[PDB]
């Protein structure tokens, strides 16, 4: 850059633009921090709900395995198909795409549709509800990580 008055004016304009950009980036970082602190509360609530969803399902499964018989539960588990309809849809957050998890499992594929081992079938229902509560925790955490890394990049 050769020393001229026009070049000096251009450099001062660039300095003003840089200062304006710094202020705008600070405002964007403040907004991102506000969103992060909004999301962390829902993350904590989802995790503490997942705790109870795990505990009651574990208790029901233990009761079913103990007082119906391990052989009865094993025979019931021998006709349970593995899940295959796992879906990972994508959603945008601040210019980044994140996966959201969902499953399309049909309920009627299991053997003995009538619940003669009632406690085993109830344990299966409890574990299905357990997974349906776990997916929310997974989605919230995978959003929170990306918000944190966006804050890092802005800083």
């Amino acid at each position: 850059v050769s020393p001229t008055r026009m070049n000096l004016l251009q450099r001062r304009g660039q300095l003003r633009l840089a200062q304006k950009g710094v202020d705008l980036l600070k405002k964007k970082r403040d907004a991102l921090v506000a969103e992060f602190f909004g999301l962390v509360r829902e993350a904590m609530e989802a995790r503490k709900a997942l705790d109870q969803a795990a505990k009651e399902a574990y208790a029901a499964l233990l009761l079913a395995q103990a007082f119906d018989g391990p052989e009865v539960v094993a025979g019931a588990a021998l006709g349970v198909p593995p899940l295959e309809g796992v879906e990972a849809e994508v959603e945008n957050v601040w210019g980044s795409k994140v996966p959201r998890l969902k499953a399309t499992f049909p309920d009627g594929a299991l053997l003995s549709p009538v619940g003669t081992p009632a406690y085993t079938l109830e344990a299966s229902r409890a574990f299905r509800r357990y997974a349906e509560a776990l997916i929310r925790v997974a989605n919230t955490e995978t959003r929170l990580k990306k918000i944190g890394e966006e804050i890092k990049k802005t800083t």
């Binding site: 008055r5 026009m6 004016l9 304006k20 705008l24 405002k27 964007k28 907004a31 969103e35």
Partner: protein, 157 residues
């Protein structure tokens, strides 16, 4: 060269008592007269306004308009990045207030406005903001002048 550090503007600032600065951005947006409120300044304004001359709510209304416009022009640039859906319920009020201010208070055309009409327009614009958020204005004037809609002047603005 639009330079405020040129000797002719520099020596003028040492002698005069303020300045009114025209804006090229407002001129290119179709606003006449393109007077920029933020960089302008009048040093002796406090002696000519108040009680016994013009109206008593002049200074507080001017200060509130200045602060609200300064907030709106700052929100408007962040709108372009983060979008309007990420804003709060009052940032959208300030963003609309800035546009309404630029479209009504400044862009007056060849009209001749008295001080009472200008104060009426200013109070109509301040009514868009929620009552009680006007920190610079005391409640005595708010209870007397707040509440008028801009649509009553929009019949012939």
């Amino acid at each position: 060269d639009d330079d405020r550090t040129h000797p002719i503007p520099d020596l003028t600032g040492y002698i005069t008592e303020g300045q009114i600065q025209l804006s090229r951005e407002l001129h290119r947006k179709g606003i006449y007269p393109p007077i920029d409120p933020l960089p302008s300044l009048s040093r002796l304004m406090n002696n000519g306004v108040g009680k016994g001359k013009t109206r008593e709510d002049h200074k507080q209304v001017s200060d509130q308009l200045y602060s609200a416009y300064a907030n709106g022009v700052d929100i408007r640039k962040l709108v372009a990045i983060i979008g309007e859906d990420a804003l709060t319920e009052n940032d959208r009020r300030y963003l609309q207030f800035a546009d309404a201010f630029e479209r009504f208070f400044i862009n007056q055309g060849q009209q001749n406005r008295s001080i009472e009409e200008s104060l009426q327009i200013a109070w109509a614009l301040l009514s868009m903001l929620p009552q009680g958020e006007l920190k610079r204005i005391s409640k005595d004037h708010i209870g007397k002048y707040y509440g008028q809609k801009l649509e009553e002047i929009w019949g012939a603005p």
